[PDB]
């Protein structure tokens, strides 16, 4: 998701503002496939770095998790 | 071909990172009992 030749710039599932190319983005891979600013989720930069590096790990939105 | 992935909430991602930083576990998917 978000790697095609024709993706729109995606709005953050929390703040509605665009998740730009120079911002950390996190994709909900639980189900929804919504994008979010890392900042908006509350995830630390270190946690984001570790989670994005691990092939067997994905992130889930607070909605999807409930 | 099927694969198991582990799904982390923000809380769990942050907690897992703390566990790695505290040298309690090797990686954020180093689950244990
Ligand atoms: Zn946002
Ligand atoms: Zn979601």
Residue numbers in the entry:
A (entry chain A): 332 to 397
B (entry chain B): 173 to 205
Provide the authors' original text about this structure.
Here, we report the crystal structure of the human PHD-HD1 complex. Our structures of the PHD-HD1 complex identify the PHD loop2 segment as the BCL9-interacting surface, with a relatively flat and hydrophobic nature. The interaction has two parts, a parallel β sheet between strands PHD β5 and HD1 β1, and a hydrophobic core between the two helices. The buried surface area is relatively small (∼1240 Å2, 15% and 18% of the total solvent-accessible surface areas of PHD and HD1, respectively), which is consistent with a relatively transient interaction, as might be expected for a signaling molecule. Superimposition of our structures of the PHD-HD1 complex on that of the free hPHD finger (Nakamura et al., 2007) shows that the structures are very similar (rmsd for the Cα backbone, 0.6 Å), except for small local conformational changes of two short loop segments. The second difference is in the PHD-HD1 interface, in a loop segment between α1 and β5 (L382–S387). This loop is pushed out in the binary complex compared to the free PHD finger (arrow 2), as a direct consequence of the PHD-HD1 interactions, opening up the A1 cavity in the complex.
